[PDB]
């Protein structure tokens, strides 16, 4: 169909406010279904590094990188129609209530959520964290 | 500025245990329930007239078999500017914080039908609520 | 294990606009409407009938008088043990966690009424859907 | 990038039993109490100073009277970006996903003020916490 | 009627977890209402021992005490309907999933709310919060 | 006090969209995701071992087709006395506001497992978690 796969992560700051049911359940009452889950108690540096290579030149990277291994990480993959650009929606940004970050954030960093943006980023990128 | 809309509360609503949800939505935006009927299988014909605008569109057929492929709700709605805020509560399934945007994702299968203009809120009303 | 109970949501619920959140607690319990009326304004020998067994009982012109003040929903619900599983949802004013628990704090505005046995509910039904 | 902004909770969340609703999406979106006052029923030259901008308005005596028509709470929250933030929470009745958008219907009776401006907030929060 | 007035008080681990709407809210949502209410960012000490005077005895005194003035407190006068015992009800305790305590907290210290107990302890109590 | 016991989400949590609702209830109790999988299928063996206990039982046969009908989710949380408090957070399908009061209705298909003593939790995190 539109049938898609995508990869989301649950950024640390998540853990720490105790919000991690809270965005995982926006996805599931959208109809959405997980296909692979993990945990990470703290995910391996090289991995976040991989993740964000295309952030590799900006000023943010480093910070970036130091949060995404401050504290735990799930990453999942999900499955649904149109999945990419509509788990995408309901990320949102912190400008936008309704979303998962409009509702939920407040900061340029620690936004609680990624997911992938194209049919390119999710292959790669669920290749990263499901690399089985 | 008050009026009167029609909203049909679609079987995949029963399937996934939204009913409640989506009545809920539309109770805390502040309108009131005028009249409803709960039908365990609507009518055929009820649900051909329902959507007789769209009777020529490839989708018709598929349409109406899902409508009946389980139960519906039909409510007439009532509140200042019902059937314009009804139908942005309704939305689409692209933006989120609306019903079909937070609980729906599907073409077809999209949880709930609001009336979109005075003509058809009366003419919708008069189908389910003669 | 399969029942059938009655279940009115009472005044005070659109009052207080819990109408949603009262149907949402017994369907996520999973338990399914099998039929359901609203009623803008019940008939008085309707809550009459559904109270008889009160009739000598000091509240019960008092009680009566609130059950007609605004609309009501009569609702056929089903569901394994349903009678007193819903029971125990609509629950009571001091114990949170059901319905009167967490929503309601008085002797007569309670919110939603269930049958309490087998008998009542048959008769309840019987009044509400003849 | 630390604001601070003024909100009230108006008369209509106290009756409808919103307060909490209200307050929570702010909480939730992690803005700060950094103080606040529950007024019974606030005196009406607070409400006329408050919405003094409004004052050759058609509607500015009948918004007075709403908001002395009951209880209402004045908050200073912090965080972020707090006065823009906190104002595309208050959002409007024709924006679902927002305070206004999903529980308001009424040029009136809207349920939350927030501060629009550096200026207005600071002007709005010394009217109701002059200290 | 049976109307009565209590004190509620919103400890500082409630500010600490962004749990106070969600409190406030139970007890909203069962026909209680706000009579008085004062937002304290850090409650005098000597409040504090006031309040938790018939505890002064006892061993966890003073680190109750320096947990109460650890962050900010709400005092809150309630008003409804056999409100002192109803609202203590909903207060719960940790072992009690339905009420506050039960569904939120997890400490014998750290329980987010104080409500009071007694008609005398009302009294009380709202004496110390709201003297005037 | 601190203790880690082992929960399993059951499938029919997945069939009826009721995850999240499940873990958030355990999360706003403050109890902490310890080590988390996720099985699309879990093998039969594992559900074997997880319910030997109840080998001899007339029931033991479908209970296990049950917990292979669809995904499930293991848990480790951590926190105070936390064997005892998310068994009652757990509960039973008579007592409304626990997670089976509230949500589900069925002897069998009731969304969670949850370890009831130290014996027990010991050995059914070291059969979903061997590492
Ligand atoms: N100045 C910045 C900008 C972004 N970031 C982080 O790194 C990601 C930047 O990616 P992005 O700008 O493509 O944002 P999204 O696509 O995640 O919305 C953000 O999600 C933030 O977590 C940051 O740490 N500092
Ligand atoms: N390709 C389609 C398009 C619409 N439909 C259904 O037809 C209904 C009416 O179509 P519409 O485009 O007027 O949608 P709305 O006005 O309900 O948003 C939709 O709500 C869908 O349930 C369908 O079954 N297949
Ligand atoms: N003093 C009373 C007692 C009950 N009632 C009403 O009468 C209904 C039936 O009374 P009941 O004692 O059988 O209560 P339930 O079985 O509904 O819990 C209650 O739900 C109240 O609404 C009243 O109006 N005044
Ligand atoms: N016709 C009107 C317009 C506004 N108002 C009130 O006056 C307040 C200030 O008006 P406004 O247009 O600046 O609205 P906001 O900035 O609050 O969105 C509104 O929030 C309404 O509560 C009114 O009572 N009657
Ligand atoms: N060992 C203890 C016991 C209680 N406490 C605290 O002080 C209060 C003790 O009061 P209590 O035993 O009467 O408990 P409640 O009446 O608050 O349920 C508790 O609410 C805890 O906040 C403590 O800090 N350490
Ligand atoms: N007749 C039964 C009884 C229990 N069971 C399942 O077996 C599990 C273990 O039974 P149990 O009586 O120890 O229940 P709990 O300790 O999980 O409450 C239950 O959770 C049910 O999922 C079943 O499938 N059929
Ligand atoms: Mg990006
Ligand atoms: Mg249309
Ligand atoms: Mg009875
Ligand atoms: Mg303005
Ligand atoms: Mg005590
Ligand atoms: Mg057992």
Not at 66 to 85: K, N, R
Request: proline fraction near 4%; aromatic fraction near 8%; include cysteine.
């Amino acid at each position: 169909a539109g049938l898609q796969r995508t990869l989301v992560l649950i950024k640390p700051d998540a853990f720490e406010r105790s919000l991690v049911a809270e965005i995982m359940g926006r996805i599931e009452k959208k109809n959405f279904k997980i296909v692979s889950m993990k945990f990470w108690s703290k995910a391996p540096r090289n991995l976040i590094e991989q993740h964000y290579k295309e952030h590799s030149e900006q000023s943010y990277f480093n910070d970036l990188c130091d949060f995404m291994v401050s504290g735990p990480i799930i990453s999942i993959v999900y499955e649904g129609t149109d999945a990419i650009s509509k788990i995408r929606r309901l990320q949102g940004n912190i400008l936008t209530p309704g979303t998962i970050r409009g509702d939920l954030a407040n900061d340029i960093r620690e936004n609680l959520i990624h997911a992938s943006d194209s049919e390119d980023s999710a292959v790669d990128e669920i290749s990263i964290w499901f690399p089985e």
